[PDB]
Short mmCIF file of C-alpha atoms in Angstrom, two decimals:
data_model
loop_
_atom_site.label_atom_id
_atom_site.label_comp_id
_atom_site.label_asym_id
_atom_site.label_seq_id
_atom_site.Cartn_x
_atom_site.Cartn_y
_atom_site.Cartn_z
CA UNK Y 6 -94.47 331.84 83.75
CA UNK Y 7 -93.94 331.11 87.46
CA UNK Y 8 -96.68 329.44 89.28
CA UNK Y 9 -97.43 329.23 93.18
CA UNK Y 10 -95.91 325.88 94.44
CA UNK Y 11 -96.88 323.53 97.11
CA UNK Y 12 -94.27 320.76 98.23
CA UNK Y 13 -96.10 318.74 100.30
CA UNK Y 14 -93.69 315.99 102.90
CA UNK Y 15 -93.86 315.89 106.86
CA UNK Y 16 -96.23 317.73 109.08
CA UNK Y 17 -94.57 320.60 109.90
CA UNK Y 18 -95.12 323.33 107.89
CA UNK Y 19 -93.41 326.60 106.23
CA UNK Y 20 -95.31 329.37 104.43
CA UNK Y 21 -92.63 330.98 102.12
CA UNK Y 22 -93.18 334.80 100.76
CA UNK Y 23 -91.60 336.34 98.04
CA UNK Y 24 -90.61 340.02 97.85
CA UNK Y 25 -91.60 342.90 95.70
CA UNK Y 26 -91.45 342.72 91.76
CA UNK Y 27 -90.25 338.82 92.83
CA UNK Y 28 -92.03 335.47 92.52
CA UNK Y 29 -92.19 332.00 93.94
CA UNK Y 30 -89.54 331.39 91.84
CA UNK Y 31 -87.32 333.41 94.50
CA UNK Y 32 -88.19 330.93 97.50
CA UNK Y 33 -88.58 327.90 94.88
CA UNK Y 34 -85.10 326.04 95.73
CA UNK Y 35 -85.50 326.68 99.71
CA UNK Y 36 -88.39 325.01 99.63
CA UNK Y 37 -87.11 321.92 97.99
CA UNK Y 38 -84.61 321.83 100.57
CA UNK Y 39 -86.98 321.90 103.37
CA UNK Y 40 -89.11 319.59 101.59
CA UNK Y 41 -85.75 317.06 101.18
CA UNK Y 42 -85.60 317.65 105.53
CA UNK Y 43 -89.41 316.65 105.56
CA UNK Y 44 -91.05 319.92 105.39
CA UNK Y 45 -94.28 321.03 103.76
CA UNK Y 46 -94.12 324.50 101.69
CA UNK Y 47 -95.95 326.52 100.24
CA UNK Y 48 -95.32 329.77 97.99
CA UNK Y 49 -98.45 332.08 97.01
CA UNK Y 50 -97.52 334.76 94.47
CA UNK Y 51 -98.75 338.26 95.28
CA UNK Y 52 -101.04 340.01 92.54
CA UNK Y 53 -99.29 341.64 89.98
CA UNK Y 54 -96.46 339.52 90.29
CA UNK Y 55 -95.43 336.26 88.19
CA UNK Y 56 -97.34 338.40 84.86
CA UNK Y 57 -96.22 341.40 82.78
CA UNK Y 58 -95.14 344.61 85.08
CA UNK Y 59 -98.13 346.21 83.28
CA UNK Y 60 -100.56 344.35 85.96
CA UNK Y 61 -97.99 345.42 88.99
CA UNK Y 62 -98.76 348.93 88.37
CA UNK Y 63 -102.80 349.20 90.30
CA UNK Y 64 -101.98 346.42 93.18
CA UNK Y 65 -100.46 347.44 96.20
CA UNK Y 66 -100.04 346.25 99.79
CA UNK Y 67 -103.66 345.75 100.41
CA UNK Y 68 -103.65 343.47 97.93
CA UNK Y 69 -100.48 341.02 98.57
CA UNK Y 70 -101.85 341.18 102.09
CA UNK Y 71 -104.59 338.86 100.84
CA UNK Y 72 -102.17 336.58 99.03
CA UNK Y 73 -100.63 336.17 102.14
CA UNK Y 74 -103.27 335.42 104.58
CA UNK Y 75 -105.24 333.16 101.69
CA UNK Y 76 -101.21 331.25 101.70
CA UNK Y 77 -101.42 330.75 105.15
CA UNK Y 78 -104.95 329.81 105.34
CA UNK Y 79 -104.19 326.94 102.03
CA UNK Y 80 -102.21 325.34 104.96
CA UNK Y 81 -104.53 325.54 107.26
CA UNK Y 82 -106.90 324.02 105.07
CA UNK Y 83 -104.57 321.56 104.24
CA UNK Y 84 -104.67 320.45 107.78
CA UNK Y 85 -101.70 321.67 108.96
CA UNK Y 86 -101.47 322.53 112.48
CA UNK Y 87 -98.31 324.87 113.25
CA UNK Y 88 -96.84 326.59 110.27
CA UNK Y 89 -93.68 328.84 110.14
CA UNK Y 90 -92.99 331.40 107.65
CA UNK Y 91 -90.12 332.71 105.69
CA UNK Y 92 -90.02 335.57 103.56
CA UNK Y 93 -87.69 337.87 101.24
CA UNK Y 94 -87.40 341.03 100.84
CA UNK Y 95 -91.01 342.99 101.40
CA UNK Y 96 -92.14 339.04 102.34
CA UNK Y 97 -89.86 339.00 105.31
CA UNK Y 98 -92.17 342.40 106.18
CA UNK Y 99 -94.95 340.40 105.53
CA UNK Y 100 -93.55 337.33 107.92
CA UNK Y 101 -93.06 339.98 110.48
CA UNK Y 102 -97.00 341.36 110.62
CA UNK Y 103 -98.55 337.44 109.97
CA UNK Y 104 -96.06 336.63 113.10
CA UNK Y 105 -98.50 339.26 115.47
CA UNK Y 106 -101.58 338.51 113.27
CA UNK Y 107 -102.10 334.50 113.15
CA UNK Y 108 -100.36 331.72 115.34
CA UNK Y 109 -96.84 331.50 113.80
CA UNK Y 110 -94.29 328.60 114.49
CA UNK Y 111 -91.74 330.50 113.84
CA UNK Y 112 -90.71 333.79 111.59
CA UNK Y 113 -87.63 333.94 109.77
CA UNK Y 114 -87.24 337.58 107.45
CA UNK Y 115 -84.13 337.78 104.75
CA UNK Y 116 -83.07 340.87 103.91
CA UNK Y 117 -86.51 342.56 105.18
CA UNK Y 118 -86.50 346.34 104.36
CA UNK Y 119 -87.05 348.56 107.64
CA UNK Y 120 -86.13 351.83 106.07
CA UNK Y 121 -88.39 353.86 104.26
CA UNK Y 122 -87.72 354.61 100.76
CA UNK Y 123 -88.99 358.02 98.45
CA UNK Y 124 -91.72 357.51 96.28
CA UNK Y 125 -89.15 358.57 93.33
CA UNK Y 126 -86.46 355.76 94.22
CA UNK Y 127 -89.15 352.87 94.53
CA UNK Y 128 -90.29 353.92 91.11
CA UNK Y 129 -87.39 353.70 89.62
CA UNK Y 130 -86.78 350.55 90.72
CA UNK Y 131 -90.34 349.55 89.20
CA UNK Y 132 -89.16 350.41 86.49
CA UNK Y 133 -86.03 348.75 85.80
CA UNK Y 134 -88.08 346.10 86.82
CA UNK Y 135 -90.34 346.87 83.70
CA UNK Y 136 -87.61 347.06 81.39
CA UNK Y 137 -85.36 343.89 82.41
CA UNK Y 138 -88.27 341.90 82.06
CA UNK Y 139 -89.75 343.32 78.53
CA UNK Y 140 -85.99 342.47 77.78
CA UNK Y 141 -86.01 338.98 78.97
CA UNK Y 142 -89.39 338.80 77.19
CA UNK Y 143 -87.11 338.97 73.82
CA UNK Y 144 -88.23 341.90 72.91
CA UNK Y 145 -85.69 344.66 70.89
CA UNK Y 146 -84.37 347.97 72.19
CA UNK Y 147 -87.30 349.89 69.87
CA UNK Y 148 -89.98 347.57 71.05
CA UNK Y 149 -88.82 348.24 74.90
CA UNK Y 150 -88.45 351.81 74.31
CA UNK Y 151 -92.42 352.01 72.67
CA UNK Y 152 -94.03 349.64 75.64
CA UNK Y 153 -91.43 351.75 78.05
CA UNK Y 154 -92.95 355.41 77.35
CA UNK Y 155 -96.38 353.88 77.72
CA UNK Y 156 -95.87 352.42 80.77
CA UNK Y 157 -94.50 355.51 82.81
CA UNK Y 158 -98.34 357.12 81.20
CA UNK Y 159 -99.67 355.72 84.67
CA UNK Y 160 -98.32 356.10 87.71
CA UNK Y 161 -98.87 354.02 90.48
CA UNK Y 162 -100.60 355.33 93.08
CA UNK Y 163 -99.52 352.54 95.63
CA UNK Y 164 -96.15 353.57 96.20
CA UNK Y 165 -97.27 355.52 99.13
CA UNK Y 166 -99.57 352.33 100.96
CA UNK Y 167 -95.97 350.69 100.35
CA UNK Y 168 -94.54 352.91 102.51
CA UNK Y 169 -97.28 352.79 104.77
CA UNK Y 170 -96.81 349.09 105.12
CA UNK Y 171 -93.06 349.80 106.29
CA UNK Y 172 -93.44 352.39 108.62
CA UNK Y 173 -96.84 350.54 110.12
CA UNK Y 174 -95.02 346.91 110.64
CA UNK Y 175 -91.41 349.04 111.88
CA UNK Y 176 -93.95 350.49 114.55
CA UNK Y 177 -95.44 347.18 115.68
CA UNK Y 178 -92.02 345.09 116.21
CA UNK Y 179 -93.02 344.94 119.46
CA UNK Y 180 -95.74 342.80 118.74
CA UNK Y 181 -93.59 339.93 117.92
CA UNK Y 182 -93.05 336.92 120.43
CA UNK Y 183 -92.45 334.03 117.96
CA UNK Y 184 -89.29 332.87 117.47
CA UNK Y 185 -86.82 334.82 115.04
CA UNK Y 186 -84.06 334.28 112.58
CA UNK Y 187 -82.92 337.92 110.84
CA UNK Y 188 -81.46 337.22 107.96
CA UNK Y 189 -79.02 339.32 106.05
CA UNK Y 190 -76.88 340.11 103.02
CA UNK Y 191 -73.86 342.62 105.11
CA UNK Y 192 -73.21 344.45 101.47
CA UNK Y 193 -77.18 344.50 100.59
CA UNK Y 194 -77.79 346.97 97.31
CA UNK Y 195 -80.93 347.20 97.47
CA UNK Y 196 -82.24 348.19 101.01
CA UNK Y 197 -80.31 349.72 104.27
CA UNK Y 198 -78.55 346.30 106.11
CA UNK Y 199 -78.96 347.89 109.30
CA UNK Y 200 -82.82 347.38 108.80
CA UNK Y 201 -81.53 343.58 109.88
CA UNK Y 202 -80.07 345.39 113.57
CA UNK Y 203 -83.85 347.29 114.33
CA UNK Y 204 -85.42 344.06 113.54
CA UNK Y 205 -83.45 341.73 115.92
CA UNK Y 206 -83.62 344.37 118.14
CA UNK Y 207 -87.39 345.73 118.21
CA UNK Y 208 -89.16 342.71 118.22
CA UNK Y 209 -89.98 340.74 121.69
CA UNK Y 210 -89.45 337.07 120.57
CA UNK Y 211 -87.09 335.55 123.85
CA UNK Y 212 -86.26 333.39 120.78
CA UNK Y 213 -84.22 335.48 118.42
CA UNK Y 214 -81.44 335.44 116.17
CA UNK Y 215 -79.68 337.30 113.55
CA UNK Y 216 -77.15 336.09 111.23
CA UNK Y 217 -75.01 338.05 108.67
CA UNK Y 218 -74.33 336.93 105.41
CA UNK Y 219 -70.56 338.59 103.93
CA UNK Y 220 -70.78 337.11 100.25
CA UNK Y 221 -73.87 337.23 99.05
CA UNK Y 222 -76.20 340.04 97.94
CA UNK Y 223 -79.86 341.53 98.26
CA UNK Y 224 -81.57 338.08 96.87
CA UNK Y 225 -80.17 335.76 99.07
CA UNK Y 226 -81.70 333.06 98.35
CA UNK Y 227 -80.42 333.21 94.16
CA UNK Y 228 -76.33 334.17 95.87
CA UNK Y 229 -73.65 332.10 96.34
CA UNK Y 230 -74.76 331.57 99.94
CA UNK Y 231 -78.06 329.87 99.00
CA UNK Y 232 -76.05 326.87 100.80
CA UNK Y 233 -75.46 327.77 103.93
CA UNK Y 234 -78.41 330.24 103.97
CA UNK Y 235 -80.48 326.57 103.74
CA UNK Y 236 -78.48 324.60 106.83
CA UNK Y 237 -79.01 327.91 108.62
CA UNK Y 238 -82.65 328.03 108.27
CA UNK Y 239 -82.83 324.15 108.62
CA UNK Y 240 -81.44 323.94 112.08
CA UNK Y 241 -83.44 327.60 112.98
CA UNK Y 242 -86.40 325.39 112.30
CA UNK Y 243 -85.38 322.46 113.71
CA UNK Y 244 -84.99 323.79 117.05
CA UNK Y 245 -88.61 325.01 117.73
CA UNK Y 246 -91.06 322.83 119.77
CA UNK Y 247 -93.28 322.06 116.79
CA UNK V 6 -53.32 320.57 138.19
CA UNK V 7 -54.00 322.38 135.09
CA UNK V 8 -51.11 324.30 132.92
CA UNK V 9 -50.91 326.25 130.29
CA UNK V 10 -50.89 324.79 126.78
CA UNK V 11 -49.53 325.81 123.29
CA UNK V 12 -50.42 323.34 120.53
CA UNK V 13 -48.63 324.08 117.18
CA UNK V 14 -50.35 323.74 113.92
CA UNK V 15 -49.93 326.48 111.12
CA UNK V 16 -49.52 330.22 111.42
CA UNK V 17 -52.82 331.72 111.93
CA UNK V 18 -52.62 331.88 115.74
CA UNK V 19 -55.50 332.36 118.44
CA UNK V 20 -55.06 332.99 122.01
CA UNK V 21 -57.49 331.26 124.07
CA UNK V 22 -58.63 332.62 127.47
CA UNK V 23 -60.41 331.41 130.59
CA UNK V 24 -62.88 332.37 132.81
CA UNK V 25 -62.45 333.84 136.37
CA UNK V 26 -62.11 330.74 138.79
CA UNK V 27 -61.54 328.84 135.66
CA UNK V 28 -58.36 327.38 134.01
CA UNK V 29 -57.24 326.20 130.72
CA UNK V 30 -59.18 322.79 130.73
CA UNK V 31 -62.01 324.93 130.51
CA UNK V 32 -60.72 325.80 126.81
CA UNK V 33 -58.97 322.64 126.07
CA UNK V 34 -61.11 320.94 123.82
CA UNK V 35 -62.00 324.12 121.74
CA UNK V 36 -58.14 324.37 121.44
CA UNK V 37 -57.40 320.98 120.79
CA UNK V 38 -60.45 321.44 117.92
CA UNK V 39 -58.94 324.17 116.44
CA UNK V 40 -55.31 322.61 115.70
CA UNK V 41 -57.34 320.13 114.26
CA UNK V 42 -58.36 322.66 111.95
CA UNK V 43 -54.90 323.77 111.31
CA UNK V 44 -55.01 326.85 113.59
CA UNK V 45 -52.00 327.42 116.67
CA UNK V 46 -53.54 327.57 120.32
CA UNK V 47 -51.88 328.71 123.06
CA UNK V 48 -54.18 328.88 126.62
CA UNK V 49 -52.40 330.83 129.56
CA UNK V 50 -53.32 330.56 133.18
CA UNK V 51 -54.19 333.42 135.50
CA UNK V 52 -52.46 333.82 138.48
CA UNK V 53 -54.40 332.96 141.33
CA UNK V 54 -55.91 330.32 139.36
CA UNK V 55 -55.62 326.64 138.59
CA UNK V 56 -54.39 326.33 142.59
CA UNK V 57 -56.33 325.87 145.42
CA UNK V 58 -59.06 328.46 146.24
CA UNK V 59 -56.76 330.13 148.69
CA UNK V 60 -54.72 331.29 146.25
CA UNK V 61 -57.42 333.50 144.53
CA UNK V 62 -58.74 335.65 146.83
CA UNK V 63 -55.02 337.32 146.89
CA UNK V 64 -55.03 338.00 143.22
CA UNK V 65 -57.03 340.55 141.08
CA UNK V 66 -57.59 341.59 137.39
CA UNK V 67 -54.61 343.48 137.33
CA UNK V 68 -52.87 340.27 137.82
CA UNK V 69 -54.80 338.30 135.92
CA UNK V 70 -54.11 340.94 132.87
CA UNK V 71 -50.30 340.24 133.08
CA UNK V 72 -50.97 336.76 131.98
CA UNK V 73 -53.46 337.74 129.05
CA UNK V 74 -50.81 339.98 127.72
CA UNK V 75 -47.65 337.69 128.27
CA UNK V 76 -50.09 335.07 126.63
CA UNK V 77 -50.18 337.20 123.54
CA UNK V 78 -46.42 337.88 123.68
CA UNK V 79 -45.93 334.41 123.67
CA UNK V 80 -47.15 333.56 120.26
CA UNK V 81 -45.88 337.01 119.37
CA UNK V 82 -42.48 336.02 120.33
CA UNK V 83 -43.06 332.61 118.82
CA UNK V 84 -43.30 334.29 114.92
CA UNK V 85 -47.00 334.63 114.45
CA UNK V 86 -47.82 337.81 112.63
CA UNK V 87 -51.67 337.63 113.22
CA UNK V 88 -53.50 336.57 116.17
CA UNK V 89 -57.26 336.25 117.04
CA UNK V 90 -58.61 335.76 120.67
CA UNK V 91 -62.09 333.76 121.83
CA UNK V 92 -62.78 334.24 126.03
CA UNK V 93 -65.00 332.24 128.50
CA UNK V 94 -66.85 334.29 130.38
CA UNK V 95 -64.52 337.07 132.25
CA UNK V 96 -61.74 335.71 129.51
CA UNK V 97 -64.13 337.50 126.49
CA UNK V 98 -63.89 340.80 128.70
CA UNK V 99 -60.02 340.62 128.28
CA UNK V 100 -61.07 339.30 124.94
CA UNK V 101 -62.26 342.97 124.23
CA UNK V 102 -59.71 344.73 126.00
CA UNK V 103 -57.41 342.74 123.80
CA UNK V 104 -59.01 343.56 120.97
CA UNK V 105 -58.25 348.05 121.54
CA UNK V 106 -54.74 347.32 122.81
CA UNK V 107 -53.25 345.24 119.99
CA UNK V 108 -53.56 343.87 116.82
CA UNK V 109 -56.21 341.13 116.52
CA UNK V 110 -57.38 339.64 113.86
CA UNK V 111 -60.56 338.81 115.40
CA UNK V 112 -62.35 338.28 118.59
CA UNK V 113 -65.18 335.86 119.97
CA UNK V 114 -65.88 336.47 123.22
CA UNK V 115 -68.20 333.24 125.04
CA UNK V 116 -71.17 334.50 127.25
CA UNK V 117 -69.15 337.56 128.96
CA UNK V 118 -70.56 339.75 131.88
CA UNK V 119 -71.41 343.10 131.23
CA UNK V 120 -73.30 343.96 133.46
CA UNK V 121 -72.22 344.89 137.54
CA UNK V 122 -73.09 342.35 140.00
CA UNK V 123 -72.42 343.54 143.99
CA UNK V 124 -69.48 342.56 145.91
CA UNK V 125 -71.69 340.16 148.19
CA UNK V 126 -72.82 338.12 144.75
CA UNK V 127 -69.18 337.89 144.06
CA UNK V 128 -67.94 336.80 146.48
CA UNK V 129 -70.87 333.81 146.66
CA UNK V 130 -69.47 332.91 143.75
CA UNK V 131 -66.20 332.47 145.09
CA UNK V 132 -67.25 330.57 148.28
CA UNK V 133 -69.15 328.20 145.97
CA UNK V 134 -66.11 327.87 143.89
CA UNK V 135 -63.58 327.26 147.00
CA UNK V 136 -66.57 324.39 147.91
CA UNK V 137 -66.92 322.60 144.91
CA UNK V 138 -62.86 322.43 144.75
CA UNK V 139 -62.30 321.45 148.00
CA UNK V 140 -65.22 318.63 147.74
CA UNK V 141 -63.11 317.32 144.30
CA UNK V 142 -59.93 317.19 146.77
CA UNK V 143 -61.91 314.11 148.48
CA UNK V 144 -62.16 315.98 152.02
CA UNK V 145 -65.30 315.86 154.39
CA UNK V 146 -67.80 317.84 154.74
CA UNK V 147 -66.87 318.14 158.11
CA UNK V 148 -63.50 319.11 157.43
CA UNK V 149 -64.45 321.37 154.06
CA UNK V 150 -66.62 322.95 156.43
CA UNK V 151 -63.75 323.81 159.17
CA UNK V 152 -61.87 324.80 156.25
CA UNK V 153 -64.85 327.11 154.73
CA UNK V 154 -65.16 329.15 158.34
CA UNK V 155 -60.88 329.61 157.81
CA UNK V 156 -61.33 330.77 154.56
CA UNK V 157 -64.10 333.51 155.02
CA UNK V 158 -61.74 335.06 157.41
CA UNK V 159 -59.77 336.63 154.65
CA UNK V 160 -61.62 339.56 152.39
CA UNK V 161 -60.92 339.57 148.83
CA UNK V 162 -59.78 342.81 148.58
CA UNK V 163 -59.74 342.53 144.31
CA UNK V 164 -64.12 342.18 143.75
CA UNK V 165 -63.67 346.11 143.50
CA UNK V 166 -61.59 345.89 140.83
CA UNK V 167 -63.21 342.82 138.85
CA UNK V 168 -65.87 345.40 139.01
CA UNK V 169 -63.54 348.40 137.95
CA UNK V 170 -62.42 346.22 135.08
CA UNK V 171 -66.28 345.12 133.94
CA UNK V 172 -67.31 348.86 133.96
CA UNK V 173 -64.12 350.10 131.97
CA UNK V 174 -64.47 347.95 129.61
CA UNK V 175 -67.97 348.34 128.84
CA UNK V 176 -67.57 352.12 129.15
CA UNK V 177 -65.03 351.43 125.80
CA UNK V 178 -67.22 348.98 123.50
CA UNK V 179 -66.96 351.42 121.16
CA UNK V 180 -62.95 351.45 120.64
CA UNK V 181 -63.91 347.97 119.59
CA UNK V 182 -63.14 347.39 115.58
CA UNK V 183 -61.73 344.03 115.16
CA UNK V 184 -64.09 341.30 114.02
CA UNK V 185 -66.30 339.97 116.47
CA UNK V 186 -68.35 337.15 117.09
CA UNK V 187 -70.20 337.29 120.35
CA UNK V 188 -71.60 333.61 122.01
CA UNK V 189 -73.96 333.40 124.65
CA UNK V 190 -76.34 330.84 126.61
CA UNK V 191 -79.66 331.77 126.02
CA UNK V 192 -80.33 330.93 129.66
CA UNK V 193 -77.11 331.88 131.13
CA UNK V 194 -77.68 331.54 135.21
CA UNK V 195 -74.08 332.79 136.31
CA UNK V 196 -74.50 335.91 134.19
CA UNK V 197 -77.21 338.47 132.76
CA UNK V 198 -77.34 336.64 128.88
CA UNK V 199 -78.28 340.40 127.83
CA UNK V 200 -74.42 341.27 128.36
CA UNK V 201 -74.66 339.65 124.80
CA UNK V 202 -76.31 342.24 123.29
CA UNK V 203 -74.93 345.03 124.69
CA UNK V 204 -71.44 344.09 123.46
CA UNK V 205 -72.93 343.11 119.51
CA UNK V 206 -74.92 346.49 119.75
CA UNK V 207 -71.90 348.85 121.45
CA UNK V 208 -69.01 347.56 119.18
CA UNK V 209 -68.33 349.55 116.42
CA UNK V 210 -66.72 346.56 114.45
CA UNK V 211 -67.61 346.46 110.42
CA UNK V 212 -67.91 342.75 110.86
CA UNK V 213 -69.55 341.27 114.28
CA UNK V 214 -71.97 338.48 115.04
CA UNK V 215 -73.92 337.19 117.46
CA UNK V 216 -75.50 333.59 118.18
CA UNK V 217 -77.66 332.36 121.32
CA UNK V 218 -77.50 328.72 121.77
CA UNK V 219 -80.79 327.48 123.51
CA UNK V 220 -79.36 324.48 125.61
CA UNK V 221 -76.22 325.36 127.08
CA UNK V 222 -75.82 326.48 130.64
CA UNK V 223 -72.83 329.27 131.10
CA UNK V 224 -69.33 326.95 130.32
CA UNK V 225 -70.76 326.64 126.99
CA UNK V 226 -66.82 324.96 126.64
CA UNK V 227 -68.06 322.11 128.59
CA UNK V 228 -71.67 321.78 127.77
CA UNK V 229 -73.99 319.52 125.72
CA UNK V 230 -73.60 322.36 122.30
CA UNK V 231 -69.71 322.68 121.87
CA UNK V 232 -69.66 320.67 119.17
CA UNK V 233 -71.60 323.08 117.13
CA UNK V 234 -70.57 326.26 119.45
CA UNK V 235 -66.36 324.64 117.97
CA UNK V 236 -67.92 324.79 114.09
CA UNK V 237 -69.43 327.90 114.45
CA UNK V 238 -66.25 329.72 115.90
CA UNK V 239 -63.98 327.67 112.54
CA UNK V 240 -66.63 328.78 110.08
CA UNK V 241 -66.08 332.39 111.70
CA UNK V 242 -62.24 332.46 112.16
CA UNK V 243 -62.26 330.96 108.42
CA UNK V 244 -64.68 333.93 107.47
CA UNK V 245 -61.54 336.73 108.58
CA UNK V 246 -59.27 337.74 106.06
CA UNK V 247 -55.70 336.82 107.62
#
């Protein structure tokens, strides 16, 4: 049952997003590394996430929108002046549109999506989604099957805002001046790696950078390079003006 | 007086290549870093260079081409089956050049021109060069000056081709394959710093990188980041599959 976190340290601070169908626990161990180098974080989780896939189903973008502007404004809050943000996956989307919306640090997206997926394929992957975690709730093959058939009753009508949310922050790159660290898995599974190329090269930031990652896959931050992925980000942060 | 060096460690091999008024002390310490790593080095000089100014303005890329090519031999000729190549400047144009003519393992090529600057720029360049090196020799101003007038007297016929060989070379990024890791000064003021992105973007190598370093001037070699810029080119040449 994964919960938001907040690591509080220094006085620099990093928002960090999750991605679709994830959770905080996806961003859990980067923040204890940047909290280990001194750095506040703090992970929101988007509605519908972190609770059964059943509540997934009627949120959308509009929604996780809020989670991240409420995560940014708990630092704020918090008194912290200049926050960064990191996100995975759809977060790294999200890092992309907070970087032209509010006054960002510094933006760094991992394995962002920048290609626009059917309706058909992102529902399948809801669903497998569905299924893996009705398995890891314990649950047997019948029960799965029963809870399975139920669930694909009612569709979810948010698929499209999803890929509204795409094509929308693809067409305001531009808008980005902060500083920015692409990251990305070179054999990614689950979205188009070259989205990492149109991102380093649409946005405006005279700070950016884009590193590619030959080991590990789609989640990053869970792969083999969660190492290196951390020094990387580290010294990315660590050379801003703060 | 400068000369060529070959230090001997185990049998992945990389040829190291200077700049354009530059010499092998320019790539010294990277090499020196490397066989510390366990990797061969071998750094020819260009004719024309590591002499007095005088010298250069007779020689030209075709020349300077001859000693790229008999610096590969060398290790060649020495047994090592694979060989990577990193270039300063108008060394990572050769770099690339290398990199369609023979077999190369990999290729980093350190904050090269791609872009055309005029004769007149040039040859700046090379009065500035002829200056500074005649200023290190200890002699007067009054006397480098009598010795500047002398030298202006004699055209360097070879800027035509230095531009020949920029343009033909950037006409055939795209016969490019061989790893590649492309370096460059964020605020490069000898060269156009977005010469880095064309070569990352034109390439048509499986496997290329890029990285900007924020406080280095142009001989990133000799600046205040080659400690980092030395473990970022190991971690790269110990990312290839040799």
């Amino acid at each position: 049952p994964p919960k938001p976190f907040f690591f509080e340290a220094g006085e620099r601070a990093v928002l960090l997003l999750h991605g679709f169908t994830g959770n905080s626990a996806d961003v859990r161990m980067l923040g204890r590394f940047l909290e280990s180098k001194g750095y506040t974080c703090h992970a929101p989780i988007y509605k519908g996430h972190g609770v059964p896939p059943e509540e997934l189903v009627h949120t959308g973008p509009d929604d996780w929108w809020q989670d991240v502007m409420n995560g940014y404004q708990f630092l704020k809050n918090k008194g912290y002046e200049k926050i960064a943000v990191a996100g995975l996956s759809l977060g790294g989307v999200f890092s992309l549109k907070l970087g032209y919306t509010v006054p960002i640090e510094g933006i760094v997206t991992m394995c962002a999506p920048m290609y626009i997926k059917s309706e058909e394929t992102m529902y399948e992957g809801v669903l497998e989604y569905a299924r893996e975690y009705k398995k890891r709730e314990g649950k047997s093959e019948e029960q799965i099957e029963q809870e399975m058939e139920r669930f694909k009753q009612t569709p979810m009508k948010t698929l499209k805002a999803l890929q509204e949310l795409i094509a929308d922050v693809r067409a305001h790159l531009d808008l980005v001046y902060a500083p920015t660290f692409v990251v990305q898995a070179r054999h990614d599974e689950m979205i188009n790696p070259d989205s990492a190329n149109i991102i380093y090269n649409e946005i405006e930031s005279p700070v950016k950078q884009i590193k590619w990652y030959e080991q590990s896959g789609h989640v990053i931050t869970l792969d083999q390079e969660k190492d290196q992925l951390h020094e990387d980000i580290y010294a990315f942060l660590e050379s801003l003006d703060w």
